[PDB]
A paper describes a structure:
Meiosis protein [name] is an essential component of the synaptonemal complex (SC), which mediates homologous chromosome synapsis.
Our crystal structure of an FFV dimer in a helical conformation demonstrates a unique, phase-shifted anti-parallel conformation. Instead, its centre is characterised by a stacking interaction of central Y85 residues. These interactions are recursive, generating a right-handed helix of FFV dimers that is continuous throughout the lattice, and is intertwined with another FFV helix in a double-helical arrangement. Thus, while we cannot exclude the possibility of the helical dimer forming in some context in vivo, it does not explain any solution state of [name], and likely constitutes an artefact of crystallisation.
Residue numbers in the entry:
A (entry chain B), B (entry chain A): 54 to 117
Amino acid sequence: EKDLNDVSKEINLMLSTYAKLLSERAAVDASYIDEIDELFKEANAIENALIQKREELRQRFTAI
Amino acid sequence: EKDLNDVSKEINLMLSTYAKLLSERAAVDASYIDEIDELFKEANAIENALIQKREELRQRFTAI
Ligand SMILES: [Cl-]
């Protein structure tokens, strides 16, 4: 007794749910990229600061 | 007046902070993977269900 209209309803409901899942995946990716970007900026700042501390060591070794 | 001991302290502190950043990145990656995995399970369940609904359509089309 389940007819083509019933099956159509189910297909449309599932595709609606898929649209929500796609939107959720985009938001999750944006959040992840945001966190990774902050981490990368901080790691790069640590790297540059380490290069200048290595140059301070170098200057003191040259004074030796 | 800032001696090699001061520079050493600063380098060790920056590398300590870097270790914390690394563990934070690992946690961010685990969290991301957990969310992506749940999304993937849900999307695959939708896909299998849509295949099942396409077969229900197919059976009704065969019924003609
Ligand atoms: Cl790393």
